[PDB]
Design a protein around this ligand. Sequence first.
Ligand SMILES: O=C(O)[C@H]1CNC[C@@H](O)[C@@H]1O
Ligand SMILES: O=C(O)[C@H]1CNC[C@@H](O)[C@@H]1O
Lengths: 602, 599
Amino acid sequence: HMLRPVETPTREIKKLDGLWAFSLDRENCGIDQRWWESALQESRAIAVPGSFNDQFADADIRNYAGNVWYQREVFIPKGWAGQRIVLRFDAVTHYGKVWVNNQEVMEHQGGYTPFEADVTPYVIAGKSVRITVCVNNELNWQTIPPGMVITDENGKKKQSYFHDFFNYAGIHRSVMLYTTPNTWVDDITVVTHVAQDCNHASVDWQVVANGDVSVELRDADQQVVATGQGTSGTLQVVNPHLWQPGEGYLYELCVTAKSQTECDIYPLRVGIRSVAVKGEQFLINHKPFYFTGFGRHEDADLRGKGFDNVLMVHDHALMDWIGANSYRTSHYPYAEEMLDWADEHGIVVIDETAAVGFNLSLGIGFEAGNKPKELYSEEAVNGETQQAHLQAIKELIARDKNHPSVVMWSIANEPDTRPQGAREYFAPLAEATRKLDPTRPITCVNVMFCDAHTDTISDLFDVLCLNRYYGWYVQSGDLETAEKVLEKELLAWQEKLHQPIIITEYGVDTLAGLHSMYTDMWSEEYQCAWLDMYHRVFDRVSAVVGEQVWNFADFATSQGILRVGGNKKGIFTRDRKPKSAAFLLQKRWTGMNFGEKPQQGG
Amino acid sequence: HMLRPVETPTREIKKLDGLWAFSLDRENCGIDQRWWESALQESRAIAVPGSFNDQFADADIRNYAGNVWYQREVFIPKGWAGQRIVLRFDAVTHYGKVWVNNQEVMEHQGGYTPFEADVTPYVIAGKSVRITVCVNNELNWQTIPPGMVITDENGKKKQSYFHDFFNYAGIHRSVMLYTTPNTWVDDITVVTHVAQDCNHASVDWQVVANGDVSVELRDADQQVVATGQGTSGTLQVVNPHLWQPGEGYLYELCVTAKSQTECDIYPLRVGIRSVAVKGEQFLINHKPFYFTGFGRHEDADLRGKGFDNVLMVHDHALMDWIGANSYRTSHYPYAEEMLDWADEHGIVVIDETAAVGFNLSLGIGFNKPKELYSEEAVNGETQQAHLQAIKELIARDKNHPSVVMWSIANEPDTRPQGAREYFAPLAEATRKLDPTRPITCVNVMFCDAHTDTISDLFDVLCLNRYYGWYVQSGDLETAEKVLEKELLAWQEKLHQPIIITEYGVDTLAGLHSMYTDMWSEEYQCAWLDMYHRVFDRVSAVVGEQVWNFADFATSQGILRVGGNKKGIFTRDRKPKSAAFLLQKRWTGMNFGEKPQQGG
Ligand SMILES: O=C(O)[C@H]1CNC[C@@H](O)[C@@H]1O
Ligand SMILES: O=C(O)[C@H]1CNC[C@@H](O)[C@@H]1O
């Protein structure tokens, strides 16, 4: 049960104050000598939210593998006497264990979705309470994402993994204590059905803990348009203002939880909108839609994957300027602020789990050992990797279920689907995801070397999501040969599956400032030509309903002879400065009419 | 047999000067309709010397594979009535064939050595004469370097190859027309022996066609120090000025060709010095020398591999500043002007053939064959092309005091058997053709001491290691333990001198990092210094040459950010902050003397 904390006859004390106490544990005795009992020794100040790696400008904290210790004191408000108090961490990256004055209250593995615990019986209103958090940043074959922790002869651990972004860790989003009455709405689910844009039914179901419920649906003018009663089985009839790409009109669903003595009211934002895959078209409110935009990353210069409000306002200014209407939460669930923003401004979003790197055939990642000889086996990606993967799909859906901006679930990104057993693994989670949320189409993002003749699992999903790099990793430099290989591949995919096709990753590494008269790899002129050749192919294949440039911005990776200080396929630099290709995309995406496929002309 | 032209009663008109007419031949019909009979149709101005690839800022010229046509007119000087006249191309890269007004005079395969021809019966002094050159840049398995032309499904050629530098082609060095009397010295060989630097001997052997000759030795003051005579070679011995890596003193041996009617005088520069490998030591006139310097490339911005005097003077100023006393002519024979400069200033040179890319296990260059040494690919025909490359490299550079060692090939894969069947005869024929200098073969990283098969056949051990870059990436401390364990494993196996001819890490100028991580200028500094503190504790190491004096152009790949970035300087010769590191080390050292495990 997961709900976004809101402030309506409910209160929150943001504990994000940053400047927590921070300590590493190289001897791995913090669990032994009970570090949560007293003030951290030889600690230093750390900002929260924020990864711990880049904050101190020291490589040995940056590449540390093990447990980190955060600690903070906080005075708990007097006026929260008869109230229930909840300690919430919206993301502790990988593993987190918390102590409230020598008492463990919570424990979570999963670095990108929130976890909380009821803290009332160990908190006194008016007294200062000390909060110790043990965070772990290791990945094994049953974590999501997977990885291999490699011990040397002296016990120093080096993390190897198989995905192309740096494994930033720490407390990445907002830590809060919030209240609630002892009768409280604990979960809301809303489904919206659309019938040619004139009258529609909003199935409601609510799991209040301790009260009867009435619901009331208010519009943007806060006028009541519909009322309902009952723990569930609320379905309200409207003459509506649809949630549309571009505007994002949001109704408001006020859920009342009234007991004999107390009362609780929760406002949930509701977008009225239907998503459906019919033929080779991805229909939003029964109209064919064309995706434009980006694969993104939660990546910045000194906060790592730390959330930040200026960074979110500025990147949406840029995505609005360049003409993008969509993005994919590339490789992990994002902060909820991001999806709340998409809800307000009508931005279409593909939501993605953290299941990246189910593939040991890429030079991508960190290679500090020897990879297993078979990916789908008891040693690697086993039945428990599958249960961890299921668990990650349920937590992801459990948080973003009612966001109207989410149009698709991405179960995984570029798994290797050649070995038999890839389907033994992915088929159960594809049907289990459809049983978790049957209102949104389902996808898995397909790697380049699993061509249409070789891929084994793509028929289990609704939309085909492709990542292609013809002319970069293969046919390097040869635009005219690449155009032929790409058009042949895309027509083969369409003929075999007859699904809609979104290209979720296409891009080339580009040094900002490197220019060439020969349109060479790594030059800004190559990026431009390469993107425009891809665009001429898309416009000639009817089944293509989306284009998402691989990254919006340069981002940090682990060290390797393929990664010049990070991955450089961004349209913008890491400090958000535009490369030449940014004006290429702006002319395309603002020259098309909104949400519709270019008819191969202009 | 070949000599570099000079000028005391021998003449020269360098047709190098300026613009020739240039045209591609995408239809391969130049030979068919015999383009040498008329002026090139639809030509354009090209500069010689210079690669044709980068001169036009056209991608379709730059990546061209096939035939290209140079053409030029020239007035034959009138004072040349009774002289015999030679047309000399000092380099036409890969293949050239020459016409001198509808008469074909010469043709050469091998893109880095000179080739000439007598042109007298086809010129008469005082008239304009047309020169057409058909240049080819295709590599196959029987060329040095080898390559693989793959033709598409219908029509176009694309050239694949296995070395890590761009395949620049065209007329890269000087084109000259020179005269000579009809009795003339054709070739001169000089070998010099020293014992304890007090009074020593110049064994002479020379071929003068067309007459009996005086041979006379003058010193830097034009003072005659010994005269001796014959027609073929006999020895000379007086009290000398040794050619030393510090100074570079050059005596001069004049050869005066006496015939009945005519006479011809050739001035040859002679540096009197010995070279010998003894135990683990590289001795120059019997004192151990310690090499410092660079693997270099002939690579400038708009000219490709075209020679250029300003670029030569500037790069030598920079190597002089940084303190390097040596360098290796990485992966092809260099311009002779470099080796004459090395003569004058006493720079020690490791000279090398174009035998690069005898390895299909790298991810550099460019359906490749299964086994390196077989009939498909490297066969008996490649072995003779390889030997021929050695023949004309040695025949070109035998008289240079600065050429201290020959390198027969660069990073060949010596794991498949047949590598020794291939390389044993090459080593012995090379010793047969010049036994005055040691010979080596530079060894790849993945063929460490317990894998390599042909280290025995050479006098010094040449190593190219990149621990911390291509393996244990970023890990300076584990790279240190691999690097030093190997350096001692090699010395126990062979007790050879060990010159590290390649070590470097790609580094983008401007990229700085508080973490000492790859691609940053800081990583380049720390990595180099760690390799240095490993060198100084291994007794058998005789030289260090960091991989590359300057960023250079390669073929396009995901491993090459707009070229190879392992340079100490950038392509325009600006110093990355590691240049100050090496100048600290190479100038704090005593000259040519190893650091004694410290400072
Ligand atoms: O290699 C790349 O640039 C991309 C290839 N596909 C997966 C991404 O995580 C990765 O960033
Ligand atoms: O990979 C590299 O940078 C070097 C490795 N050894 C041989 C060089 O030609 C090459 O350039």
